[PDB]
Beta-lactamase
Amino acid sequence: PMSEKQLADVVERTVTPLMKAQAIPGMAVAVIYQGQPHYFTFGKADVAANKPVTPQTLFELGSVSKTFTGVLGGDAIARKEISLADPVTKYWPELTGKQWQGIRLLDLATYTAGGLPLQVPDNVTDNASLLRFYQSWQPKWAPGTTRLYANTSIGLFGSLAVKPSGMRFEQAMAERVFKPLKLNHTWINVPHAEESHYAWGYREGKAVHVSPGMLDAEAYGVKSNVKDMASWVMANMAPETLPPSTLQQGIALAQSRYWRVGAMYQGLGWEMLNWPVDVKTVVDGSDNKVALVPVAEVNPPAPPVKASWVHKTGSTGGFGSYVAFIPEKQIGIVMLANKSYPNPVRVETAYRILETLQ
């Protein structure tokens, strides 16, 4: 096996030229190897203040948040509070339009409603306007037949999935996911007392934080540090080491295979490819296209496959994050950066580091 010094050299030799070429001010990396997290930090969390990235620096996870939403939804299924087969209208009866007949929680969770768009419009700022948005939406294809990656899809899934619990989404996430996993520095809203740890993001050289928006918490709103994110990867890679619970069951539901697009399988938030797989296949299987694509159904959904590359990319205006793991090999990686840089580059960087552990 690689020593800690050998692993540090692999990470540093990869990340240093990457950060220079991409103008990424700061990165935090965790490698999961031999059952242990290994932390590596680089650069600046706050350029103007010359504050370094540390293992306590909070980054915006952007769409990596969808993995938390998927697991929380899986937990609600395991609690018997919701079923993926339930109609959307069971949880939002005001969605009376005929286009909503036949659309299920499954379709919201996995982007198969028939072309719900990527973003909630910024001018939609309350529930009355959000209702009008969904009631005006016209699908392009029948439900359960196409994939279009969308915050309006999985974001609405998360909001509806928590309704039987009596808690708002943020409360439910804290009580049912963050707290049982001891993710005590993972936040949907960064508390005032934690702001000193919150990195700035950088877009066109300017310091930025994610803007508020409807469904933000559900689709892109989690902030976390590299230590909690390493714990999140460990819990999802080896849920059998957790005590028996609805959360453990929900982790399994989120890594179940519901649809296939090419070499990618869609979970709840998580996405998977069968392992072994070449890096070019992972890159080609992780583009969320602007246009709709057809899907193949996995019926019934297939339970988690240990021989998988499991991953999620995510960004905000100022941040770029990536998590990936291979349960068969018990290796994984977290890369948090305070600039958004291309998703294929995140995959290539992660794949190269993980390949040295094999």
In short: Residues 1-358 form a domain with the Beta-lactamase fold (CATH 3.40.710.10). The radius of gyration is 19 Å.
